[PDB]
Structures are given as structure tokens and as C-alpha cells.
Amino acid sequence: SVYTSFMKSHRCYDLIPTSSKLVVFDTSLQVKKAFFALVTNGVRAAPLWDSKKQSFVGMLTITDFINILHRYYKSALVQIYELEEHKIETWREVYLQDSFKPLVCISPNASLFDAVSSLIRNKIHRLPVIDPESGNTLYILTHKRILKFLKLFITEFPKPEFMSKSLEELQIGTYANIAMVRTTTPVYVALGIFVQHRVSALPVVDEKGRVVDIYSKFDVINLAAEKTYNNLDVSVTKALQHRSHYFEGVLKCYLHETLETIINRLVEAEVHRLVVVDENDVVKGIVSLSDILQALVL
Amino acid sequence: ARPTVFRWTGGGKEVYLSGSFNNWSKLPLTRSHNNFVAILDLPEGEHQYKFFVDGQWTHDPSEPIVTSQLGTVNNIIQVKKTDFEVFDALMVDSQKCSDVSELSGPYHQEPYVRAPPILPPHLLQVILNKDTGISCDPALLPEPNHVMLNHLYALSIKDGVMVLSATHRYKKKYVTTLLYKPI
Amino acid sequence: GRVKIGHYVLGDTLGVGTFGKVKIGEHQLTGHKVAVKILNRQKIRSLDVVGKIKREIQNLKLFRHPHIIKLYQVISTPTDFFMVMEYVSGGELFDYICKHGRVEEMEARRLFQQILSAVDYCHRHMVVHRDLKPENVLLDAHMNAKIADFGLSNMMSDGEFLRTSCGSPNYAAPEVISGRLYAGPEVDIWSCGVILYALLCGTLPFDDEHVPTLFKKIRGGVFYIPEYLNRSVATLLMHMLQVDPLKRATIKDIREHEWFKQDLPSYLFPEDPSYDANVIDDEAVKEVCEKFECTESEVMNSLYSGDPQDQLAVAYHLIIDNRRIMNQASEFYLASSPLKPHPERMPPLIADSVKKAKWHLGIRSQSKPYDIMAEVYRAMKQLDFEWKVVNAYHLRVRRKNPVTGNYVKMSLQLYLVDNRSYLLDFKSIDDPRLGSHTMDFFEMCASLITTLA
Numbered sequence: 001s002v003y004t005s006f007m008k009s010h011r012c013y014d015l016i017p018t019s020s021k022l023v024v025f026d027t028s029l030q031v032k033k034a035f036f037a038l039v040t041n042g043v044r045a046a047p048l049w050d051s052k053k054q055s056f057v058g059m060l061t062i063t064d065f066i067n068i069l070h071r072y073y074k075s076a077l078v079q080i081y082e083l084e085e086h087k088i089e090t091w092r093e094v095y096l097q098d099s100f101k102p103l104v105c106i107s108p109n110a111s112l113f114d115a116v117s118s119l120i121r122n123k124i125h126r127l128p129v130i131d132p133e134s135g136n137t138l139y140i141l142t143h144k145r146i147l148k149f150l151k152l153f154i155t156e157f158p159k160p161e162f163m164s165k166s167l168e169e170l171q172i173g174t175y176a177n178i179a180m181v182r183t184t185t186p187v188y189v190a191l192g193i194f195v196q197h198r199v200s201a202l203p204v205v206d207e208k209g210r211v212v213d214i215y216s217k218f219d220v221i222n223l224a225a226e227k228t229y230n231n232l233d234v235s236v237t238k239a240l241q242h243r244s245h246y247f248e249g250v251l252k253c254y255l256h257e258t259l260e261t262i263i264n265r266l267v268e269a270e271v272h273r274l275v276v277v278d279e280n281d282v283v284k285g286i287v288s289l290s291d292i293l294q295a296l297v298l
Numbered sequence: 299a300r301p302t303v304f305r306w307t308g309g310g311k312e313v314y315l316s317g318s319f320n321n322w323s324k325l326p327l328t329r330s331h332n333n334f335v336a337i338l339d340l341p342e343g344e345h346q347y348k349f350f351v352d353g354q355w356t357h358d359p360s361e362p363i364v365t366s367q368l369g370t371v372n373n374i375i376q377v378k379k380t381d382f383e384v385f386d387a388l389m390v391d392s393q394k395c396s397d398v399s400e401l402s403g404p405y406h407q408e409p410y411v412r413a414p415p416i417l418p419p420h421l422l423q424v425i426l427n428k429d430t431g432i433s434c435d436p437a438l439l440p441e442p443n444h445v446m447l448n449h450l451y452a453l454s455i456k457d458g459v460m461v462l463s464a465t466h467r468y469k470k471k472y473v474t475t476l477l478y479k480p481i
Numbered sequence: 482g483r484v485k486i487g488h489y490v491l492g493d494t495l496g497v498g499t500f501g502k503v504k505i506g507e508h509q510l511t512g513h514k515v516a517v518k519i520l521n522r523q524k525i526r527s528l529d530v531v532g533k534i535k536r537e538i539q540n541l542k543l544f545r546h547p548h549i550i551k552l553y554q555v556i557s558t559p560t561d562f563f564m565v566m567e568y569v570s571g572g573e574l575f576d577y578i579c580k581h582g583r584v585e586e587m588e589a590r591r592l593f594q595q596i597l598s599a600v601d602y603c604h605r606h607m608v609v610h611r612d613l614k615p616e617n618v619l620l621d622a623h624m625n626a627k628i629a630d631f632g633l634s635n636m637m638s639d640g641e642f643l644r645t646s647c648g649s650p651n652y653a654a655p656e657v658i659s660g661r662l663y664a665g666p667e668v669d670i671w672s673c674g675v676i677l678y679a680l681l682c683g684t685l686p687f688d689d690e691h692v693p694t695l696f697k698k699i700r701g702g703v704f705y706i707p708e709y710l711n712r713s714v715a716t717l718l719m720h721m722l723q724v725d726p727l728k729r730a731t732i733k734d735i736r737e738h739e740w741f742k743q744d745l746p747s748y749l750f751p752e753d754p755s756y757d758a759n760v761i762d763d764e765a766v767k768e769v770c771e772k773f774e775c776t777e778s779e780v781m782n783s784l785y786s787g788d789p790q791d792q793l794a795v796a797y798h799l800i801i802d803n804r805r806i807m808n809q810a811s812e813f814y815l816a817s818s819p820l821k822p823h824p825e826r827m828p829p830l831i832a833d834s835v836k837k838a839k840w841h842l843g844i845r846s847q848s849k850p851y852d853i854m855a856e857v858y859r860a861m862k863q864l865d866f867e868w869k870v871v872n873a874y875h876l877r878v879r880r881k882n883p884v885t886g887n888y889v890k891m892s893l894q895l896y897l898v899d900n901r902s903y904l905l906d907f908k909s910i911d912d913p914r915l916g917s918h919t920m921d922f923f924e925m926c927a928s929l930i931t932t933l934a
């Protein structure tokens with residue numbers, strides 16, 4: 001209802017920062033160099049410019065890094081040769097293969113409804129905003145950015161009735177076949193779980209099944225920042241120890257908690273999902289910005 | 299109303315305006331400190347006129363003249379429809395300025411045949427060398443100064459790649475693009 | 482025997498401005514007074530400033546601010562333009578200070594707040610006044626300040642600097658008296674510093690009968706601060722009269738200063754409670770009349786004289802409400818300054834198998850400037866660049882992008898940085914479509930950079 005017409009009222013332009021930086025890679029760049037440029041510039045995704053086609057052909061994200069590691073990694077005793085030799089262009093030739101997978105983008109003057117629609121239809125977390133008159137890329141749109149923007153306006157309209165209904169009563173999120181890793185699970189297995197089940201994060205659980213930590217795709221890039229990507233035999237726990245002093249624990253929610261409560265918790269914590277648990281912290285499911293934005297446009 | 303100004307700047311004690319519009323009768327002019335002026339409502343088209351200053355016919359040096367068959371010389375002014383809308387007048391005036399600029403250039407390959415301007419300090423505020431508070435989104439930047447926009451910034455070539463960046467405005471918002479190009 | 486222009490009888494000259502003569506005029510029915518700036522058309526063509534007048538007319542026409550003199554209409558004639566403006570009877574601020582000696586702190590602050598409000602309004606509209614001084618600040622019968630003469634003003638263009646040195650030396654910033662390039666909003670603030678000083682003390686901070694001596698005092702930036710001024714406003718003066726333009730106070734600095742905030746009216750600045758209800762936002766009136774097909778005069782008529790529930794008004798107010806929500810999350814639209822880390826903060830890259838690289842502007846070279854340019858001409862020739870010469874050190878270059886078929890343009894400028902070392906600056910130009918204008922500018926710069934050495 002009302003949140004739907006809000007999305008249709010605002011162009012994507014309104015979400016764009018007043019001032020922001022954007023990293024572009026020419027397709028002929030070495031793929032290892034590009035992952036380092038993500039780390040040094042602090043951004044997790046870059047548009048890909050093909051100087052022969054004179055066109056934006058796609059995006060480079062951390063998922064590319066996860067895909068290259070899971071495919072070409074063999075042992076800690078040998079280098080991963082395809083990560084050093086591959087140019088972006090040659091990696092995309094290998095990875096894309098049969099899938100048409102053209103560039104998905106959105107105009108600055110398109111509605112927010114169209115952005116959420118594009119995100120869900122193509123099952124992606126980054127929609128680059130390209131201005132059709134100059135051809136320039138402007139900003140990388142995400143689910144977080146759309147939800148935080150909506151959170152700013154919830155006081156401006158009459159609040160719907162489902163905002164006060166519990167997570168249990170609305171059936172929002174995934175309650176079955178949760179992809180998880182143990183505390184001792186090696187990184188390489190987690191990367192494989194990322195490739196097989198396409199999901200943004202794996203909750204980390206102890207032997208009795210309650211979540212002690214969370215391993216996002218984002219945390220994989222620390223492998224690039226620490227240049228530890230050559231040993232993937234280490235456990236997810238050892239892979240997250242760099243975070244231990246500023247980590248306050250896993251953001252969770254229960255099923256009796258209201259959807260407005262959930263939205264505020266995610267917008268404030270600026271993460272992509274909450275872990276739905278029970279009294280004892282054992283994981284009963286996931287609620288993601290994917291689920292939440294999808295439910296608000298239904 | 300189509301106001302037309304008749305201004306005499308050449309001094310004198312009494313100045314009258316005569317022309318075809320008043321049937322060549324003397325119209326007393328109002329005096330400022332120097333100027334003698336009248337503002338008349340005139341139809342478009344050609345008008346002949348002469349100033350009468352201290353008992354003597356005298357021509358206006360600012361306007362063109364015309365000689366009749368019997369030898370009298372008058373100024374003529376042209377009242378055009380384009381004179382009474384300011385943007386139409388400016389468009390006409392900007393065309394007359396481009397016309398004189400023709401009788402006083404294309405792209406070419408020939409070089410040119412006194413020190414360079416000092417570098418202004420604002421261009422040495424490098425927006426990508428500035429740190430941002432760690433609490434905010436790593437893609438956000440401070441608001442740029444309008445004067446650093448469109449200028450090229452770069453890093454030293456290293457390992458065969460050159461990195462370029464610049465800040466460009468889209469509407470009321472600002473984007474700083476980096477490009478990683480192998481050399 | 483009266484001189485009338487469009488219902489107004491023209492009176493005596495009020496003054497001769499920077500460009501044009503200002504006469505009073507009185508409505509032949511109601512007696513209403515106006516001030517008429519006259520511009521001679523032939524003068525404008527002989528100086529080839531037609532474009533600068535047209536832009537000056539378009540801008541002053543949409544300027545509506547309580548402390549800027551309003552333009553009502555422009556009446557055109559074969560030989561002259563008449564600009565009918567709001568008349569105010571209080572005369573110059575300069576005459577007020579002179580006749581009162583100093584000005585009491587509560588009144589001096591009120592005036593300064595009004596003047597600075599109009600200056601900020603100009604800058605936010607990309608206009609710099611450049612003639613700011615107490616002779617160009619007029620009072621109305623109620624002692625409200627009005628900025629007046631825009632003859633020297635200029636638009637602030639993206640990527641561009643202002644050179645032109647004109648105006649009264651006493652109000653001129655150290656960079657304008659030196660002939661350096663400046664951005665231009667910093668130069669207005671310097672003048673507001675001198676006006677503030679002239680408001681509080683009846684004198685100028687930098688004054689000398691010997692003009693080259695005056696220029697050394699301004700460049701040095703040392704001035705006497707009397708002890709009857711408190712220390713907070715002393716801090717505000719030294720911040721505005723700072724010699725380094727990068728260390729000089731901005732408008733946001735001043736608005737945060739404790740002496741300025743005291744008794745400050747809510748309507749003078751856009752982030753303040755009463756601004757939206759008073760000062761019209763020219764971008765929202767353009768937006769509402771994009772949605773509905775109507776003139777900018779109709780939207781402003783329903784706001785001024787209309788009923789609140791009008792559709793032009795509710796649309797307008799709705800835009801302003803949305804823009805308030807967005808402005809009041811500045812953290813979301815703008816980066817802060819140096820706290821729990823943002824979840825996406827990246828760790829630093831560690832060594833190899835780490836130093837933070839520094840961006841620099843353009844290209845530095847120590848060759849003699851004539852030698853630098855010859856290598857520029859040679860490199861472009863090799864690359865199939867066509868170009869034009871603005872001056873010896875300034876080139877306008879273009880190349881046809883072979884894939885897209887578009888032309889891509891660039892401005893090259895040579896600067897002196899250190900004593901004997903120089904820098905070449907690269908600036909993009911612009912004038913559905915395949916490719917990207919920004920990539921085209923990067924690839925064109927990249928080609929040129931590699932060819933040099």
C-alpha cells in the first residue's frame with residue numbers, strides 16, 4: 001500500500017549522496033590488482049569499463065573474489081596461478097560463459113520502485129545508476145541504501161498495520177535450509193557454500209547449534225587486505241579474529257518481535273540481515289533486506 | 299507604449315527636438331546636469347529628426363543621417379519590434395557583436411609564436427587525500443569546492459597502471475570517479 | 482514636460498553605479514518611488530558585454546531576498562534599457578556610520594547578520610558580488626540593509642577562477658590586490674570583514690593615503706583591534722580577515738560563531754526554523770511548474786496571496802518538506818570529519834606479498850615553461866588532437882572518439898607552483914548516447930600523459 005506509492009514517487013536521484021566516490025576498472029586490468037584497489041579505496045564494488053566497446057559491461061564485486069578463490073585454490077603449498085594471471089576480461093570470459101548476463105543498471109530519473117524491482121528480478125545487491133544523457137555512472141545502489149532512505153520518511157505517512165505485526169505472523173524471511181558453518185569450518189568450505197547456495201552471509205554456530213559469530217561475503221575481502229588469501233585451510237573463526245576487539249556480537253531478532261522493530265534494528269546497525277533465533281540463541285532463520293524490501297513492494 | 303529616447307549630450311542652454319513625428323515643431327527638452335532628454339511614444343519604422351540647440355540646427359553624431367532632395371540633412375532612427383522586448387533586444391545586440399568579431403577561429407594543429415599564472419591554492423586541496431570519519435559510509439566524501447570540479451587528479455604510475463580521478467557535478471550532487479587504466 | 486518611462490516620472494540622479502546611471506522615479510498616479518538603473522545599449526555592444534548583461538538580468542530577476550534590492554521590471558527601448566528597482570530612503574550605510582561615529586554592538590550585529598544573509602544567498606545562487614562595501618549597502622526607513630550594485634558581480638562557474646581586479650582597494654582581499662586567481666566567495670567574506678570592522682569602529686582596518694603602502698598593509702594582514710570590542714567578536718574578525726584564503730572563515734564558520742548566533746533571527750539562513758516559510762526556493766518553484774504546466778508567476782501567486790490548500794501550494798510545500806527530511810540527515814548525504822565503525826569500513830592493505838599513496842593535481846615538470854609547451858604541442862600532434870590557443874599557456878583541445886563518434890574536449894593550463902617548478906592542469910569541457918563523458922575525459926588525459934616524459 002502506502003510504502004509502495006512512496007517508492008513510485010521518488011526517483012533514484014534522491015538516494016544519491018551529495019558527494020561520493022566511485023571506482024571504475026578498465027576490463028584489461030589484472031583481477032588481483034582490482035581486488036587490492038577495492039581494499040585501498042574502501043569500496044566493495046566497481047563498475048567495469050570496456051575501452052574497446054566504449055561501454056559499461058558490468059560490475060566487479062567481492063563475489064567475484066569468492067568465485068575465483070573457490071575455483072582455482074588448490075593448497076596452501078602452491079600459488080593460485082589464475083588469480084595472478086587473469087585480467088578482468090579473461091576472468092569474465094570464464095565465469096560468465098553461457099549466461100547472457102548483460103549489464104543491469106537504472107537511470108537517475110527512474111523510481112525507487114523500479115530499483116527494488118531490478119534488484120529482486122536479477123537477484124543482485126548492487127544496481128549502478130547510469131545517467132543516460134552523459135553516460136556517466138553516478139552511484140552504486142543497494143538494499144541498505146533504499147531501506148535507510150525509507151526509514152527517514154516513515155514518520156511522514158500514516159504507518160500501515162503490518163508494521164506492528166510480528167515476524168512470526170507475517171512470515172518474512174527464510175525459515176528452512178539455513179546455510180551455516182561451524183566454528184571450525186575452513187574458509188574454503190564457506191566459500192563453496194557461498195557459491196552453491198547464493199546467500200550473503202553464513203551464521204557461525206557452536207556444536208550445540210547457537211550462533212557465536214557471522215561470516216559475511218564482506219569479511220572475505222579481509223583475505224585480500226591481509227594477503228592471507230593463499231591459505232584457505234584456516235577456520236572461519238581464525239578468519240574473523242582480526243575483528244574480535246571491535247566486534248559486539250551477532251545482531252539477532254525473535255519471531256515475536258514486530259516488523260517495525262526489525263526495520264529499526266537493521267537500519268541502525270547498517271547490516272544486511274538479522275539472525276532469527278530462539279531463547280537459547282539456536283538459529284531458527286534469517287531475515288534479510290532482500291526479504292524486507294520484497295515484502296514492502298508486494 | 300513604445301518609448302523612444304532622444305538624448306542630447308552636447309551641452310547648451312536650450313535644446314529642442316524636431317522631427318517627422320511632431321511635424322518639425324520645436325519640442326522643449328528636459329535638462330539634467332548635462333543631458334537634454336525626451337522620451338516619446340513612436341510607432342515602429344523610420345523616423346527623421348534634428349536637434350535645435352541655441353538657435354541652430356545641429357545633427358546628432360550618434361545616429362546616421364539622410365539628405366533630402368532639397369538638401370536638408372536629418373538624423374534617422376529605426377524603431378524595430380525587437381527593441382521593446384529586452385531579450386529580443388539582447389539577441390539582436392549579441393548578433394551585432396558576433397558580426398564585428400568576424401571582421402577583426404577553427405581548430406588547428408599549428409603551435410604558438412611573460413610567466414605562467416601562479417597556481418591557485420584551492421586546487422591543492424585533494425579530496426581523496428582527506429580522511430572521513432570512520433563511522434560513516436566509506437563512499438561518502440565532503441562537499442567539494444565548486445572550483446576544483448572537472449580538474450584531473452592522479453597517482454604516480456606504478457606496476458603499469460595509471461589511476462585518474464576528477465569530481466563532476468550531476469544536478470545538485472557530486473561524483474568523484476576513479477579510473478584504473480593499464481598503461 | 483516630464484520624462485516618463487512606463488508610468489514613472491524620472492527625477493534626479495541618485496548616483497552613478499559601476500555600470501549605468503540610477504535615477505529616481507515616481508509613479509505619476511500614486512507617487513510610489515522606484516530606482517531606475519539606465520543602461521545604454523551602444524555602450525554594451527562597444528564593450529561586447531551583451532552576454533554579461535543578459536545573464537545579469539536573468540539572475541537579478543529571479544533574486545528574491547529581503548536584504549537584496551529587488552528588480553521589478555526591465556523596460557527596453559531602441560537606445561537604452563531601464564531597470565526599475567525597489568527604492569529605499571535610508572541612503573548608504575556609509576553615511577550612517579559616518580554620521581553616528583561607531584555603531585552600537587546590538588545594532589551592528591543586526592546589520593551584519595542581514596548583510597551576510599544576502600551574501601550567502603548570492604553564493605548559494607552561484608553569484609559573487611565583488612563590490613561589497615558600506616556605500617553599496619542601502620538602508621530602508623526601518624534600518625534594514627540592502628545590497629545594491631551588481632555591476633561588478635560574476636557567475637561562479639565549475640572549475641573556473643576569477644582574476645579581474647576592480648573595486649575599492651580598502652575592501653579588496655590580499656589575493657585580488659596581488660593579481661592572483663581566486664574562487665570568489667572567499668573575497669566577499671573578506672569584504673564583510675571590513676564592513677564588520679567599519680560597523681564596530683568608525684574606521685577601516687587597512688587605510689593609508691599612500692596607495693602602495695595600503696597594499697603592503699593588506700597583504701600583511703595586521704590590523705589594530707580596539708579594546709572596547711570584546712574578545713569573541715575579535716576572534717570573528719581575525720577569522721574573516723585571515724590572510725591565507727584557505728584559513729579564512731567561511732559563511733558556515735561565521736554562522737557557528739557565538740557572537741553571530743546571539744539574537745539571530747530564524748529567517749535569515751536556510752538551515753534555520755523560519756527560512757522555508759519566508760524565503761522562496763527557486764528550484765522548488767521550477768519543479769512544481771514542471772509537473773503542472775504554469776508560469777513561475779502563478780506558483781508564486783498562490784503562495785503569497787493564495788489559500789494554503791491550493792494545489793500549486795501543497796505541491797510546493799510538499800517538496801520543501803521532503804527536502805527538509807533529506808537535509809536533516811546530513812550524515813546520510815555527506816561524509817563527516819574525524820565512534821563505532823561503519824560495518825563496511827575496510828582494513829588497510831598490508832605491505833606486499835602499507836604506505837598511503839597521495840593524489841596530486843595534474844602533471845609537474847621542472848622544464849622551462851616554453852619547453853613544456855613545445856612538448857605539449859608535439860605530443861598532441863602525434864595523437865591527432867585538434868586544438869585552439871586561448872593564450873600561450875592555455876589550450877582548448879579536442880579529439881574525435883572513434884568508436885562513439887562524439888567529440889571530447891579538454892582545457893590545458895600551465896601554472897607556476899614552486900619557485901622554478903611548474904604544473905600542467907587538465908580540465909574537462911562539456912557541450913541515448915554511447916560511451917561516457919567522464920571516461921572520455923580520462924582516456925583523453927591518459928593518452929596525453931603517457932606520450933610525455
Ligand SMILES: Cc1ccc(Oc2nc3cc(-c4ccc5c(ccn5C)c4)c(Cl)cc3[nH]2)cc1C(=O)O
Pocket residue numbers: 303305328329330331333334335337484491492497500501502504519520521561
Ligand atoms: C554613466 C552613464 C550611464 C548611462 C548612460 O546612458 C544614458 N544616460 C541616460 C539618461 C537619461 C535621462 C536623461 C535626462 C533626464 C532623465 C530624467 C530626467 N532628465 C532630465 C533621464 C535617459 Cl532617458 C537615457 C540615458 N542613457 C550614460 C552615462 C554617462 O556616461 O553619462
Ligand SMILES: Nc1ncnc2c1ncn2[C@@H]1O[C@H](COP(=O)(O)O)[C@@H](O)[C@H]1O
Pocket residue numbers: 058059060061062063064101102103104105123124125126127128
Ligand atoms: N548491475 C549488475 N549487472 C550485471 N551483473 C552484476 C550486477 N551486479 C552484480 N552482478 C554480478 O553479480 C555478482 C555478485 O552479485 P552481488 O550479490 O550483487 O554482489 C558479480 O560477480 C557480477 O557478475
Ligand SMILES: Nc1ncnc2c1ncn2[C@@H]1O[C@H](COP(=O)(O)O)[C@@H](O)[C@H]1O
Pocket residue numbers: 173174176177178179180198199200201202203272273286287288289290291
Ligand atoms: N545463510 C542463509 N541461509 C539460507 N537462506 C538465506 C541465508 N541468507 C539469506 N538467505 C535468504 O536468501 C534470500 C536473499 O538473501 P541475501 O543474500 O541476504 O539477499 C532471502 O530470501 C534470505 O532470507
Ligand SMILES: Nc1ncnc2c1ncn2[C@@H]1O[C@H](COP(=O)(O)O)[C@@H](O)[C@H]1O
Pocket residue numbers: 200201214215216217218219249250251252270271272273274275824825
Ligand atoms: N547480523 C549481524 N550481526 C553482526 N554483524 C553483522 C551482521 N550482519 C553483517 N554483519 C557484519 O557487517 C559487515 C558487513 O556485512 P553485510 O551486512 O553483508 O554488508 C561484516 O563485517 C559482517 O560480518
